[PDB]
């Protein structure tokens, strides 16, 4: 299983054409402020295949 091929899953909004995002930060999936603590309603967008 090659897990090096990962990609971003969650983001605040969409992308303008032809640009790249390298923000490796927790994404808040709900009303719980992650504040660098992860947990519920908080996910790491980068996941592999």
């Amino acid at each position: 299983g090659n897990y090096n091929y990962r990609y971003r899953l969650f983001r605040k909004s969409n992308l303008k054409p032809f640009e790249r995002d390298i923000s490796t930060e927790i994404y808040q999936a709900g009303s719980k402020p992650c504040n660098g603590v992860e947990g519920f309603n908080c996910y790491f967008p980068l996941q592999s295949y």
Binding site: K16, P17, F18, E19, R20
Partner: protein, 82 residues
């Protein structure tokens, strides 16, 4: 060149070209669709304080194929540190 940059991480783009510079120097910077456009013009100014009365066009100077979500900018000086 050691102004402020101290933790320059791995990055993508570098470029070098000719230098630009009572000199009225006008520049236009635009960012459209991951493209950076720079127009420039240099004139000999003879007015005291503010912009003069007249008309002068600006020629295109450089284009860059780099996509950045630019929102702010600042000017760089070279003070007499001595």
């Amino acid at each position: 060149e050691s102004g402020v940059y101290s933790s320059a991480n791995n990055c993508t783009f570098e470029y070098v070209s000719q230098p630009f510079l009572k000199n009225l120097r006008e520049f236009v910077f635009k960012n459209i669709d991951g493209y950076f456009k720079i127009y420039s013009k240099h004139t000999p100014i003879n007015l005291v304080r503010d912009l003069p009365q007249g008309f002068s066009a600006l020629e295109p100077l450089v284009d860059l194929p780099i996509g950045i979500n630019i929102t702010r900018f600042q000017t760089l000086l070279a003070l007499h540190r001595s």
